[PDB]
Each structure stands twice: as C-alpha cells, then as structure tokens.
PDB file of C-alpha atoms and ligand atoms in Angstrom:
ATOM      1  CA  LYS A   1      15.153 -11.246  23.927  1.00 34.51           C
ATOM      2  CA  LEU A   2      16.138 -12.471  20.398  1.00 32.80           C
ATOM      3  CA  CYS A   3      13.874 -10.889  17.688  1.00 34.68           C
ATOM      4  CA  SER A   4      12.272  -8.597  20.338  1.00 34.02           C
ATOM      5  CA  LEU A   5      15.739  -7.115  20.988  1.00 38.63           C
ATOM      6  CA  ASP A   6      16.407  -4.601  18.157  1.00 37.79           C
ATOM      7  CA  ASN A   7      14.977  -7.042  15.543  1.00 40.86           C
ATOM      8  CA  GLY A   8      17.791  -9.488  16.438  1.00 39.96           C
ATOM      9  CA  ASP A   9      20.294  -7.220  14.506  1.00 41.77           C
ATOM     10  CA  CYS A  10      18.540  -8.357  11.231  1.00 44.84           C
ATOM     11  CA  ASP A  11      18.125  -5.890   8.308  1.00 47.98           C
ATOM     12  CA  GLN A  12      14.678  -7.345   7.447  1.00 48.10           C
ATOM     13  CA  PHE A  13      12.765 -10.443   8.621  1.00 48.98           C
ATOM     14  CA  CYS A  14      13.674 -12.082  11.905  1.00 49.31           C
ATOM     15  CA  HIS A  15      12.482 -15.475  13.121  1.00 48.82           C
ATOM     16  CA  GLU A  16      13.344 -17.424  16.323  1.00 46.15           C
ATOM     17  CA  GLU A  17      14.486 -21.052  15.923  1.00 43.25           C
ATOM     18  CA  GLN A  18      15.404 -23.040  19.056  1.00 45.54           C
ATOM     19  CA  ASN A  19      16.518 -20.112  21.265  1.00 43.01           C
ATOM     20  CA  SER A  20      18.314 -18.588  18.224  1.00 46.43           C
ATOM     21  CA  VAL A  21      17.708 -15.619  15.855  1.00 44.73           C
ATOM     22  CA  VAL A  22      17.488 -16.455  12.127  1.00 41.01           C
ATOM     23  CA  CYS A  23      17.457 -13.490   9.680  1.00 40.20           C
ATOM     24  CA  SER A  24      15.932 -13.494   6.139  1.00 42.69           C
ATOM     25  CA  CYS A  25      15.123 -11.023   3.303  1.00 44.22           C
ATOM     26  CA  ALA A  26      12.349 -10.022   0.838  1.00 41.41           C
ATOM     27  CA  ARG A  27      12.281 -11.479  -2.638  1.00 43.14           C
ATOM     28  CA  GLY A  28      15.013  -9.809  -4.723  1.00 45.79           C
ATOM     29  CA  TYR A  29      17.574  -9.558  -1.872  1.00 43.63           C
ATOM     30  CA  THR A  30      20.125 -12.175  -0.755  1.00 44.13           C
ATOM     31  CA  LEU A  31      21.252 -12.662   2.846  1.00 45.78           C
ATOM     32  CA  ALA A  32      24.881 -11.475   3.247  1.00 47.62           C
ATOM     33  CA  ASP A  33      27.814 -13.635   4.523  1.00 44.62           C
ATOM     34  CA  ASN A  34      27.252 -12.322   8.062  1.00 41.72           C
ATOM     35  CA  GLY A  35      23.736 -13.827   8.007  1.00 41.80           C
ATOM     36  CA  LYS A  36      22.094 -10.487   8.908  1.00 42.14           C
ATOM     37  CA  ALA A  37      22.266  -7.864   6.132  1.00 43.22           C
ATOM     38  CA  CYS A  38      20.204  -8.064   2.928  1.00 41.88           C
ATOM     39  CA  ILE A  39      21.871  -7.407  -0.493  1.00 41.21           C
ATOM     40  CA  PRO A  40      19.892  -6.365  -3.611  1.00 40.79           C
ATOM     41  CA  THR A  41      20.366  -8.923  -6.441  1.00 39.59           C
ATOM     42  CA  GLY A  42      19.668  -6.436  -9.262  1.00 43.26           C
ATOM     43  CA  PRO A  43      18.604  -2.833 -10.189  1.00 42.41           C
ATOM     44  CA  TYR A  44      15.364  -1.287  -8.720  1.00 41.77           C
ATOM     45  CA  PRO A  45      15.039  -3.690  -5.740  1.00 42.49           C
ATOM     46  CA  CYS A  46      11.718  -3.567  -3.878  1.00 40.14           C
ATOM     47  CA  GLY A  47      11.171  -1.069  -1.091  1.00 41.17           C
ATOM     48  CA  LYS A  48      13.792   1.554  -2.121  1.00 40.06           C
ATOM     49  CA  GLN A  49      13.015   5.123  -3.192  1.00 43.46           C
ATOM     50  CA  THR A  50      14.677   5.672  -6.595  1.00 40.97           C
ATOM     51  CA  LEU A  51      17.775   7.979  -7.013  1.00 45.88           C
ATOM     52  CA  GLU A  52      18.573   7.385 -10.778  1.00 47.82           C
TER      53      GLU A  52
ATOM     54  CA  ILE B   1      -5.011  13.020   0.624  1.00 48.44           C
ATOM     55  CA  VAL B   2      -6.094  15.736   3.091  1.00 48.83           C
ATOM     56  CA  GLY B   3      -2.979  17.476   4.455  1.00 46.05           C
ATOM     57  CA  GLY B   4       0.526  15.932   4.272  1.00 45.38           C
ATOM     58  CA  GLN B   5       2.956  16.737   1.457  1.00 46.87           C
ATOM     59  CA  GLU B   6       3.854  16.279  -2.241  1.00 48.52           C
ATOM     60  CA  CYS B   7       5.826  13.150  -3.080  1.00 47.07           C
ATOM     61  CA  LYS B   8       9.202  14.485  -4.215  1.00 42.74           C
ATOM     62  CA  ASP B   9      11.218  12.995  -7.109  1.00 44.54           C
ATOM     63  CA  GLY B  10      11.663   9.207  -6.513  1.00 43.33           C
ATOM     64  CA  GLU B  11       9.922   9.119  -3.099  1.00 45.28           C
ATOM     65  CA  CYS B  12       6.731   7.177  -3.941  1.00 43.32           C
ATOM     66  CA  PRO B  13       7.836   4.994  -6.888  1.00 42.56           C
ATOM     67  CA  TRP B  14       5.348   2.154  -6.119  1.00 43.63           C
ATOM     68  CA  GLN B  15       2.253   4.347  -6.650  1.00 44.04           C
ATOM     69  CA  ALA B  16      -0.051   3.217  -9.508  1.00 40.31           C
ATOM     70  CA  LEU B  17      -3.166   5.140 -10.725  1.00 40.26           C
ATOM     71  CA  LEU B  18      -6.234   3.381 -12.223  1.00 40.16           C
ATOM     72  CA  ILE B  19      -7.523   5.552 -15.089  1.00 38.42           C
ATOM     73  CA  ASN B  20     -10.927   5.611 -16.798  1.00 40.54           C
ATOM     74  CA  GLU B  21     -11.896   5.939 -20.518  1.00 43.89           C
ATOM     75  CA  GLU B  22     -11.390   9.721 -20.250  1.00 43.46           C
ATOM     76  CA  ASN B  23      -7.841   9.272 -18.792  1.00 43.25           C
ATOM     77  CA  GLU B  24      -9.000  10.359 -15.338  1.00 47.29           C
ATOM     78  CA  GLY B  25      -7.846   8.643 -12.139  1.00 49.22           C
ATOM     79  CA  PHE B  26     -10.585   7.113  -9.988  1.00 48.11           C
ATOM     80  CA  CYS B  27      -8.521   4.783  -7.675  1.00 46.04           C
ATOM     81  CA  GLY B  28      -4.914   4.031  -6.675  1.00 45.53           C
ATOM     82  CA  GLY B  29      -2.796   0.873  -6.664  1.00 46.20           C
ATOM     83  CA  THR B  30       0.573  -0.480  -5.418  1.00 46.26           C
ATOM     84  CA  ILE B  31       3.234  -1.941  -7.758  1.00 48.35           C
ATOM     85  CA  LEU B  32       4.169  -5.398  -6.446  1.00 46.19           C
ATOM     86  CA  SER B  33       6.321  -6.603  -9.396  1.00 46.87           C
ATOM     87  CA  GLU B  34       6.800  -6.070 -13.144  1.00 47.95           C
ATOM     88  CA  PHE B  35       3.438  -7.796 -13.878  1.00 48.61           C
ATOM     89  CA  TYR B  36       1.302  -7.156 -10.747  1.00 48.99           C
ATOM     90  CA  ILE B  37      -0.700  -4.277  -9.172  1.00 50.12           C
ATOM     91  CA  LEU B  38      -2.396  -4.427  -5.720  1.00 50.11           C
ATOM     92  CA  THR B  39      -5.699  -2.493  -5.396  1.00 50.72           C
ATOM     93  CA  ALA B  40      -9.116  -2.534  -3.665  1.00 51.10           C
ATOM     94  CA  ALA B  41     -11.938  -4.878  -4.775  1.00 49.34           C
ATOM     95  CA  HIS B  42     -14.463  -2.085  -4.409  1.00 48.79           C
ATOM     96  CA  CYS B  43     -12.579  -0.065  -7.072  1.00 48.38           C
ATOM     97  CA  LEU B  44     -13.498  -2.613  -9.780  1.00 50.34           C
ATOM     98  CA  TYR B  45     -17.050  -1.282  -9.844  1.00 50.43           C
ATOM     99  CA  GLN B  46     -16.010   2.369 -10.400  1.00 51.45           C
ATOM    100  CA  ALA B  47     -15.524   1.870 -14.206  1.00 52.21           C
ATOM    101  CA  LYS B  48     -16.195  -0.584 -17.095  1.00 52.69           C
ATOM    102  CA  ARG B  49     -12.872  -0.253 -18.947  1.00 49.72           C
ATOM    103  CA  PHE B  50      -9.716   0.940 -17.212  1.00 49.07           C
ATOM    104  CA  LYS B  51      -5.910   1.039 -17.506  1.00 49.26           C
ATOM    105  CA  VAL B  52      -3.037   1.499 -15.053  1.00 48.48           C
ATOM    106  CA  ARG B  53      -0.634   4.449 -15.104  1.00 49.71           C
ATOM    107  CA  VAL B  54       2.755   4.462 -13.282  1.00 49.93           C
ATOM    108  CA  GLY B  55       5.654   6.938 -12.928  1.00 53.11           C
ATOM    109  CA  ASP B  56       3.393  10.008 -12.649  1.00 53.49           C
ATOM    110  CA  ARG B  57       3.597  12.855 -10.062  1.00 54.65           C
ATOM    111  CA  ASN B  58       1.901  15.799 -11.846  1.00 54.97           C
ATOM    112  CA  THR B  59      -1.186  14.944 -13.957  1.00 57.08           C
ATOM    113  CA  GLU B  60      -0.824  18.358 -15.725  1.00 58.96           C
ATOM    114  CA  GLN B  61       2.608  17.939 -17.427  1.00 55.93           C
ATOM    115  CA  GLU B  62       4.707  15.264 -19.189  1.00 54.46           C
ATOM    116  CA  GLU B  63       7.642  14.439 -16.853  1.00 56.25           C
ATOM    117  CA  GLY B  64       8.950  11.649 -19.116  1.00 55.83           C
ATOM    118  CA  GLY B  65       8.629   8.778 -16.663  1.00 57.87           C
ATOM    119  CA  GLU B  66       4.936   7.994 -17.247  1.00 57.29           C
ATOM    120  CA  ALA B  67       3.757   4.682 -18.689  1.00 58.02           C
ATOM    121  CA  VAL B  68       0.249   3.374 -19.338  1.00 57.28           C
ATOM    122  CA  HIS B  69      -0.409  -0.366 -19.045  1.00 59.66           C
ATOM    123  CA  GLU B  70      -3.379  -2.531 -20.069  1.00 59.09           C
ATOM    124  CA  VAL B  71      -4.902  -5.111 -17.770  1.00 57.34           C
ATOM    125  CA  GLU B  72      -4.824  -8.765 -18.847  1.00 60.80           C
ATOM    126  CA  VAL B  73      -6.563 -10.185 -15.739  1.00 59.45           C
ATOM    127  CA  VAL B  74      -8.618  -8.839 -12.815  1.00 58.16           C
ATOM    128  CA  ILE B  75      -8.296 -11.063  -9.691  1.00 60.12           C
ATOM    129  CA  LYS B  76     -10.920  -9.973  -7.121  1.00 59.10           C
ATOM    130  CA  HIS B  77     -11.223 -11.665  -3.704  1.00 57.40           C
ATOM    131  CA  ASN B  78     -14.184 -14.051  -3.999  1.00 57.40           C
ATOM    132  CA  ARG B  79     -15.390 -13.328  -0.434  1.00 60.25           C
ATOM    133  CA  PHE B  80     -15.529  -9.534  -1.008  1.00 61.78           C
ATOM    134  CA  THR B  81     -18.848  -7.921  -0.052  1.00 60.68           C
ATOM    135  CA  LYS B  82     -20.255  -4.462  -0.730  1.00 59.88           C
ATOM    136  CA  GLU B  83     -22.269  -4.331   2.477  1.00 62.24           C
ATOM    137  CA  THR B  84     -19.278  -4.192   4.842  1.00 62.20           C
ATOM    138  CA  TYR B  85     -16.257  -3.924   2.443  1.00 63.19           C
ATOM    139  CA  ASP B  86     -14.864  -7.060   4.100  1.00 63.96           C
ATOM    140  CA  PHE B  87     -12.147  -8.714   1.893  1.00 62.75           C
ATOM    141  CA  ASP B  88     -11.548  -5.392   0.058  1.00 62.98           C
ATOM    142  CA  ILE B  89      -8.587  -6.588  -2.086  1.00 63.60           C
ATOM    143  CA  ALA B  90      -7.844  -7.314  -5.779  1.00 64.10           C
ATOM    144  CA  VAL B  91      -4.726  -8.081  -7.815  1.00 61.90           C
ATOM    145  CA  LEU B  92      -4.261  -7.045 -11.488  1.00 66.58           C
ATOM    146  CA  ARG B  93      -1.940  -8.852 -13.960  1.00 65.07           C
ATOM    147  CA  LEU B  94      -0.755  -6.506 -16.705  1.00 60.91           C
ATOM    148  CA  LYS B  95      -0.548  -7.305 -20.461  1.00 60.03           C
ATOM    149  CA  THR B  96       3.041  -5.896 -20.673  1.00 59.61           C
ATOM    150  CA  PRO B  97       5.723  -5.760 -17.939  1.00 61.48           C
ATOM    151  CA  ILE B  98       6.539  -2.511 -16.118  1.00 63.55           C
ATOM    152  CA  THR B  99      10.038  -1.323 -16.849  1.00 66.41           C
ATOM    153  CA  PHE B 100      11.443  -0.020 -13.541  1.00 63.45           C
ATOM    154  CA  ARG B 101      13.219   3.410 -13.530  1.00 66.10           C
ATOM    155  CA  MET B 102      13.164   6.749 -11.706  1.00 66.63           C
ATOM    156  CA  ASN B 103       9.707   6.999 -10.045  1.00 67.94           C
ATOM    157  CA  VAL B 104       8.757   3.375 -11.009  1.00 65.69           C
ATOM    158  CA  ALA B 105       9.710   0.589  -8.541  1.00 66.01           C
ATOM    159  CA  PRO B 106       7.957  -2.039  -6.449  1.00 67.55           C
ATOM    160  CA  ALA B 107       7.164  -1.977  -2.722  1.00 68.16           C
ATOM    161  CA  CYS B 108       8.223  -5.110  -0.736  1.00 64.95           C
ATOM    162  CA  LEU B 109       5.792  -7.734   0.511  1.00 65.34           C
ATOM    163  CA  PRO B 110       6.612  -8.590   4.167  1.00 61.52           C
ATOM    164  CA  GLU B 111       6.215 -11.959   5.955  1.00 60.50           C
ATOM    165  CA  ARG B 112       3.022 -12.048   8.166  1.00 57.80           C
ATOM    166  CA  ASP B 113       4.301 -12.658  11.736  1.00 60.33           C
ATOM    167  CA  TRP B 114       7.251 -10.233  11.346  1.00 57.97           C
ATOM    168  CA  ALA B 115       5.056  -7.494   9.777  1.00 57.86           C
ATOM    169  CA  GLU B 116       2.403  -7.786  12.524  1.00 59.57           C
ATOM    170  CA  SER B 117       4.816  -7.805  15.449  1.00 59.25           C
ATOM    171  CA  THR B 118       7.423  -5.389  14.027  1.00 57.54           C
ATOM    172  CA  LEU B 119       5.924  -3.162  11.261  1.00 63.23           C
ATOM    173  CA  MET B 120       2.379  -2.785  12.604  1.00 63.50           C
ATOM    174  CA  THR B 121       3.728  -1.769  16.012  1.00 64.93           C
ATOM    175  CA  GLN B 122       5.875   1.103  14.559  1.00 66.94           C
ATOM    176  CA  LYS B 123       4.434   4.598  15.330  1.00 65.05           C
ATOM    177  CA  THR B 124       3.321   5.318  11.759  1.00 64.67           C
ATOM    178  CA  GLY B 125       2.753   4.137   8.176  1.00 65.81           C
ATOM    179  CA  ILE B 126       2.580   6.273   4.981  1.00 66.05           C
ATOM    180  CA  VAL B 127      -0.440   6.601   2.712  1.00 67.86           C
ATOM    181  CA  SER B 128      -0.364   8.168  -0.764  1.00 67.13           C
ATOM    182  CA  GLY B 129      -2.530   9.249  -3.744  1.00 67.58           C
ATOM    183  CA  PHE B 130      -4.018  11.743  -6.249  1.00 67.13           C
ATOM    184  CA  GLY B 131      -7.334  11.708  -4.349  1.00 67.09           C
ATOM    185  CA  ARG B 132      -9.505  14.512  -3.025  1.00 67.88           C
ATOM    186  CA  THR B 133      -7.799  17.166  -0.998  1.00 66.81           C
ATOM    187  CA  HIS B 134     -11.028  17.997   0.995  1.00 69.56           C
ATOM    188  CA  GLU B 135     -14.045  15.895   1.918  1.00 68.03           C
ATOM    189  CA  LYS B 136     -15.836  17.559  -1.033  1.00 67.78           C
ATOM    190  CA  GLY B 137     -12.948  19.237  -2.845  1.00 66.85           C
ATOM    191  CA  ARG B 138     -11.495  18.421  -6.268  1.00 67.77           C
ATOM    192  CA  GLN B 139      -8.899  15.688  -6.923  1.00 67.95           C
ATOM    193  CA  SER B 140      -5.224  16.505  -6.621  1.00 68.27           C
ATOM    194  CA  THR B 141      -3.148  17.100  -9.756  1.00 62.94           C
ATOM    195  CA  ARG B 142      -0.113  16.259  -7.597  1.00 62.62           C
ATOM    196  CA  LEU B 143       0.742  12.939  -5.995  1.00 61.55           C
ATOM    197  CA  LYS B 144       0.688  13.352  -2.258  1.00 61.26           C
ATOM    198  CA  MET B 145       1.855  11.311   0.718  1.00 64.10           C
ATOM    199  CA  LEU B 146       1.002  11.521   4.442  1.00 66.37           C
ATOM    200  CA  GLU B 147       2.392   9.957   7.600  1.00 65.56           C
ATOM    201  CA  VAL B 148      -0.522   8.306   9.530  1.00 67.01           C
ATOM    202  CA  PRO B 149      -0.276   6.912  13.060  1.00 65.95           C
ATOM    203  CA  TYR B 150      -1.395   3.361  13.681  1.00 67.75           C
ATOM    204  CA  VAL B 151      -4.549   3.565  15.787  1.00 67.45           C
ATOM    205  CA  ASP B 152      -5.392   1.305  18.791  1.00 68.44           C
ATOM    206  CA  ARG B 153      -7.859  -1.329  17.575  1.00 72.60           C
ATOM    207  CA  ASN B 154     -10.295  -1.009  20.546  1.00 71.12           C
ATOM    208  CA  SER B 155     -10.421   2.808  20.109  1.00 73.84           C
ATOM    209  CA  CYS B 156     -11.046   2.348  16.418  1.00 70.56           C
ATOM    210  CA  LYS B 157     -13.962  -0.015  16.984  1.00 69.28           C
ATOM    211  CA  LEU B 158     -15.468   2.424  19.496  1.00 69.02           C
ATOM    212  CA  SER B 159     -15.399   5.358  17.023  1.00 69.90           C
ATOM    213  CA  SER B 160     -16.947   3.457  14.099  1.00 71.39           C
ATOM    214  CA  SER B 161     -20.609   3.431  13.093  1.00 70.86           C
ATOM    215  CA  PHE B 162     -19.710   0.506  10.748  1.00 71.11           C
ATOM    216  CA  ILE B 163     -18.271  -2.959  11.520  1.00 69.35           C
ATOM    217  CA  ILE B 164     -14.420  -3.306  11.633  1.00 71.75           C
ATOM    218  CA  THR B 165     -13.676  -6.899  10.684  1.00 68.97           C
ATOM    219  CA  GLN B 166     -10.566  -8.977  11.290  1.00 67.97           C
ATOM    220  CA  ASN B 167      -9.505  -7.985   7.686  1.00 63.66           C
ATOM    221  CA  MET B 168      -9.268  -4.260   8.493  1.00 62.21           C
ATOM    222  CA  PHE B 169      -7.160  -1.878  10.549  1.00 57.35           C
ATOM    223  CA  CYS B 170      -7.303   1.825  11.391  1.00 60.47           C
ATOM    224  CA  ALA B 171      -4.791   4.651  10.984  1.00 64.50           C
ATOM    225  CA  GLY B 172      -4.839   8.428  11.129  1.00 66.88           C
ATOM    226  CA  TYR B 173      -5.872  11.101  13.617  1.00 66.44           C
ATOM    227  CA  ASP B 174      -8.672  11.801  16.069  1.00 66.49           C
ATOM    228  CA  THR B 175      -9.075  15.518  15.284  1.00 69.23           C
ATOM    229  CA  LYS B 176      -6.009  16.680  13.290  1.00 70.83           C
ATOM    230  CA  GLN B 177      -6.960  17.511   9.651  1.00 67.93           C
ATOM    231  CA  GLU B 178      -4.979  14.827   7.802  1.00 68.37           C
ATOM    232  CA  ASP B 179      -6.480  11.688   6.204  1.00 71.47           C
ATOM    233  CA  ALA B 180      -6.756   9.822   2.917  1.00 73.35           C
ATOM    234  CA  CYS B 181      -9.934  10.750   0.981  1.00 70.55           C
ATOM    235  CA  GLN B 182     -12.062   9.964  -2.100  1.00 71.21           C
ATOM    236  CA  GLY B 183     -10.042   8.675  -5.067  1.00 72.70           C
ATOM    237  CA  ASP B 184      -7.119   7.412  -2.925  1.00 71.96           C
ATOM    238  CA  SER B 185      -8.927   4.033  -2.543  1.00 71.23           C
ATOM    239  CA  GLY B 186      -6.895   0.995  -3.657  1.00 70.42           C
ATOM    240  CA  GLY B 187      -3.670   3.011  -3.010  1.00 68.99           C
ATOM    241  CA  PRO B 188      -0.583   2.158  -0.893  1.00 67.79           C
ATOM    242  CA  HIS B 189      -0.257   2.092   2.904  1.00 69.00           C
ATOM    243  CA  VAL B 190       3.453   1.344   3.431  1.00 69.81           C
ATOM    244  CA  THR B 191       5.669   1.009   6.530  1.00 69.57           C
ATOM    245  CA  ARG B 192       9.350   2.014   6.583  1.00 68.76           C
ATOM    246  CA  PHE B 193      11.916  -0.256   8.371  1.00 69.06           C
ATOM    247  CA  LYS B 194      15.672   0.602   8.056  1.00 69.72           C
ATOM    248  CA  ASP B 195      15.056   2.664   4.871  1.00 73.52           C
ATOM    249  CA  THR B 196      13.089  -0.177   3.171  1.00 72.05           C
ATOM    250  CA  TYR B 197       9.326   0.253   2.521  1.00 71.99           C
ATOM    251  CA  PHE B 198       6.916  -2.700   2.911  1.00 73.96           C
ATOM    252  CA  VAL B 199       3.244  -2.915   1.928  1.00 72.02           C
ATOM    253  CA  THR B 200       1.091  -3.013   5.102  1.00 73.31           C
ATOM    254  CA  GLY B 201      -2.330  -1.745   3.914  1.00 73.39           C
ATOM    255  CA  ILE B 202      -4.672  -0.804   1.085  1.00 71.65           C
ATOM    256  CA  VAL B 203      -6.789   2.432   1.252  1.00 73.08           C
ATOM    257  CA  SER B 204     -10.362   1.088   1.812  1.00 74.70           C
ATOM    258  CA  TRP B 205     -12.927   3.446   3.413  1.00 75.46           C
ATOM    259  CA  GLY B 206     -13.950   6.026   6.039  1.00 74.57           C
ATOM    260  CA  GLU B 207     -16.907   8.077   7.373  1.00 74.87           C
ATOM    261  CA  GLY B 208     -16.035  11.145   5.285  1.00 70.97           C
ATOM    262  CA  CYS B 209     -12.444  12.391   5.240  1.00 69.98           C
ATOM    263  CA  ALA B 210     -10.536  13.707   8.244  1.00 71.31           C
ATOM    264  CA  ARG B 211     -13.700  14.040  10.458  1.00 71.93           C
ATOM    265  CA  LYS B 212     -13.367  14.556  14.222  1.00 73.49           C
ATOM    266  CA  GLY B 213     -13.485  11.249  16.121  1.00 77.21           C
ATOM    267  CA  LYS B 214     -13.230   9.206  12.886  1.00 77.23           C
ATOM    268  CA  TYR B 215     -10.196   7.349  11.358  1.00 71.42           C
ATOM    269  CA  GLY B 216      -9.220   5.880   7.934  1.00 71.60           C
ATOM    270  CA  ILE B 217      -9.856   2.160   7.489  1.00 71.87           C
ATOM    271  CA  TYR B 218      -7.403  -0.009   5.469  1.00 72.59           C
ATOM    272  CA  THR B 219      -7.445  -3.571   4.221  1.00 69.99           C
ATOM    273  CA  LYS B 220      -5.073  -5.590   6.470  1.00 70.10           C
ATOM    274  CA  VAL B 221      -2.589  -6.893   3.885  1.00 67.11           C
ATOM    275  CA  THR B 222      -0.874  -9.198   6.384  1.00 66.37           C
ATOM    276  CA  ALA B 223      -4.040 -11.327   6.585  1.00 64.88           C
ATOM    277  CA  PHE B 224      -3.854 -11.708   2.747  1.00 68.35           C
ATOM    278  CA  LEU B 225      -0.203 -12.638   2.102  1.00 68.35           C
ATOM    279  CA  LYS B 226      -0.877 -16.259   1.081  1.00 67.96           C
ATOM    280  CA  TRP B 227      -3.804 -15.161  -1.132  1.00 68.28           C
ATOM    281  CA  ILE B 228      -1.618 -12.501  -2.821  1.00 62.94           C
ATOM    282  CA  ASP B 229       1.138 -15.120  -3.385  1.00 64.02           C
ATOM    283  CA  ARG B 230      -1.342 -17.527  -5.025  1.00 65.19           C
ATOM    284  CA  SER B 231      -2.819 -14.793  -7.202  1.00 62.46           C
ATOM    285  CA  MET B 232       0.644 -13.760  -8.460  1.00 65.23           C
ATOM    286  CA  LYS B 233       1.655 -17.304  -9.487  1.00 62.30           C
ATOM    287  CA  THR B 234      -1.629 -17.679 -11.403  1.00 59.64           C
TER     288      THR B 234
HETATM  289  C1  LIG C 301     -18.708   4.443   5.296  1.00 61.06           C
HETATM  290  C2  LIG C 301     -18.247   4.271   3.832  1.00 61.06           C
HETATM  291  C3  LIG C 301     -19.149   3.311   3.070  1.00 61.06           C
HETATM  292  O1  LIG C 301     -19.990   3.760   2.306  1.00 61.06           O
HETATM  293  N1  LIG C 301     -18.943   1.973   3.226  1.00 61.06           N
HETATM  294  C4  LIG C 301     -19.950   1.028   2.737  1.00 61.06           C
HETATM  295  C5  LIG C 301     -20.073  -0.214   3.634  1.00 61.06           C
HETATM  296  O2  LIG C 301     -18.848  -0.639   4.251  1.00 61.06           O
HETATM  297  C6  LIG C 301     -18.138   0.392   4.904  1.00 61.06           C
HETATM  298  C7  LIG C 301     -17.739   1.362   3.805  1.00 61.06           C
HETATM  299  N2  LIG C 301     -18.023   5.577   3.168  1.00 61.06           N
HETATM  300  C8  LIG C 301     -18.934   6.709   3.280  1.00 61.06           C
HETATM  301  C9  LIG C 301     -18.319   7.771   2.358  1.00 61.06           C
HETATM  302  C10 LIG C 301     -16.870   7.345   2.130  1.00 61.06           C
HETATM  303  N3  LIG C 301     -16.378   7.767   0.806  1.00 61.06           N
HETATM  304  S1  LIG C 301     -15.126   8.752   0.530  1.00 61.06           S
HETATM  305  O3  LIG C 301     -15.243   9.964   1.294  1.00 61.06           O
HETATM  306  O4  LIG C 301     -15.117   8.802  -0.905  1.00 61.06           O
HETATM  307  C11 LIG C 301     -13.696   7.862   1.152  1.00 61.06           C
HETATM  308  C12 LIG C 301     -13.261   6.647   0.541  1.00 61.06           C
HETATM  309  C13 LIG C 301     -12.140   5.944   1.054  1.00 61.06           C
HETATM  310  C14 LIG C 301     -11.479   6.460   2.204  1.00 61.06           C
HETATM  311  C15 LIG C 301     -10.368   5.775   2.766  1.00 61.06           C
HETATM  312  C16 LIG C 301      -9.737   6.288   3.925  1.00 61.06           C
HETATM  313 CL1  LIG C 301      -8.377   5.429   4.598  1.00 61.06          CL
HETATM  314  C17 LIG C 301     -10.190   7.493   4.533  1.00 61.06           C
HETATM  315  C18 LIG C 301     -11.316   8.203   4.005  1.00 61.06           C
HETATM  316  C19 LIG C 301     -11.946   7.695   2.852  1.00 61.06           C
HETATM  317  C20 LIG C 301     -13.051   8.382   2.297  1.00 61.06           C
HETATM  318  C21 LIG C 301     -16.886   5.854   2.472  1.00 61.06           C
HETATM  319  O5  LIG C 301     -16.009   5.039   2.200  1.00 61.06           O
HETATM  320 CA1  LIG C 302       2.760  13.868 -15.517  1.00 62.74          CA
END
C-alpha cells in the first residue's frame, strides 16, 4: 500500500501523510505539476551520468 | 576494485581522487556539490598535504576533463575512532568551486527513511575507484566500477572478526572474486533508482580484498545525513 506499492508512482522520495502518498525530489529538482515527476532546475543535476 | 569493469565516458562523474604531494592517489571521494567532497575519516591520516582531482578516468593520459582542487577545510567526524573505524566519515570544503561538465557531476543525497526502506533494499549498489586490482597488486590506472549486492546484516556480523557497528553496512560476495580494495577507501557507494544515482555508502574497510567468506564494509551514509547537512552549511 501507498509508498510500498511501486514507490507510490513517485520519481524520487515518497512519504505517507494521512493515508496519502506525497512525492518529493532531491535538491536541484522541482516537483512537476502532476506532483510525482522530478524536473532538473539547471545543467548537470545530481545523480545523472553526463552525456555532453 | 577487484573485478568489475572500467567506467565508460560519463558513467561515474561523481568520483573524486585524493592525491598526495607526488600526485599519486591514495583514497577516493564523492562529489556532493560544487564546494563539497565526501570521503572517509581514516583517509585523513594517509598524507600530510593533499589535493582533490575530479574528471579523471585514465591516470596515464590527459583527457581534457581533469581538474585539481585545493582543500580549504577538513571536517572529520569528532566521534571517529581508529580502533574500530566507527564514524568513518569526513567532508572537505574546496578553495574553488568545481565546474560541472562531461565526467564531473554530483551524486544525489537521499532522505534517510526513503533511502533505508527503498534504496538499501534494492538488490545491488555500485562501488568505484582507482584502487588495487588484487589484494596485493598495484593500483589501477583506470577508474573502475563494480556492482555489489547488499548483504544480510546478520550474515555479515557472523563472517566478521571485527565489530560491525550501527554506522556500517556490508556489500559484496561470499566467494566470487569481486570487491573494493586498498586505495578505494573514501570512494562512492551509490544506488540507482529510475536512472538517478544516490549516495548510500563510503568505502571503509575489509579483511583483505575479495576473500572467501568475507565482505566489504561501508560507512552507512543514511545514519549521517543530518551531520553531512550541517557540515555543508558550515
Ligand atoms: C580489518 C581492517 C582494519 O585494519 N581495520 C582496523 C580496525 O577497524 C576495522 C578496520 N583492514 C585490514 C586490511 C584492510 N586494508 S585494505 O586491504 O587496504 C582494504 C581497505 C578498504 C577496503 C574496503 C572494502 Cl569495502 C573492501 C576491502 C578493503 C580493503 C583493512 O581495512
Ligand atoms: Ca587522465
């Protein structure tokens, strides 16, 4: 249930608040409009292998 | 690193190497941000004066991504002890900021509860370094990485002739010949989740390298997240 079920559909951090999943992101990402995906705020975000 | 593979272009961008007076690596580190490196407390006794190098994969050629940085501050955990290697963690603030680019980028710091229930319960983490390639071989001229299974805590305690504290965890193989080794200490143990890599460990110690019935022991980063945050603000 909730975060134990496929990370609650969150890209990164998942927390349970009052029988409800709440997603969040590492520093340097912002939580998208859907409240689940994490968007990098600038170049070379943490945790990503580099391609350029 | 005993076994595993070479890090290919851009695959281990958070690797840092601590270098001595003679420009020789003696310990690893993890890039946390433009000003901070994560390493092992025990490494700060392996040299008087040292610098940090980033963006390097082959210590025998100039690839064009390399950068050497001077250390402004050494922040060692005050409860660290040489007898057990408990609290084996230090943070370095650099004099100049690291300019990110190909082969130079930070690893993410996770939140504690999520990392422990979701990252630390994945099958494997990844360890990397320019350390020895055999228990008593020479150091690698090539940055290597290796996938290491998380090891059951009870089994780890049973196999160890030395105490495994609450600030440590085990990873690796019972008999397969793959392990971190000498000179990889202070280096990254990272865990991948949806193509994003988070810091989960620091290379700390082991009874030899890749020995039968013995595993690699890592500092448990998740127990140090508030301490790391404090160190990075000051
Ligand atoms: C048992 C331990 C030791 O001396 N300790 C002192 C007291 O606390 C426990 C560590 N030893 C004995 C030799 C060994 N040195 S090493 O082969 O250079 C080495 C160093 C770090 C390592 C990290 C890992 Cl994850 C795996 C193997 C390692 C081997 C090492 O770390
Ligand atoms: Ca080089």
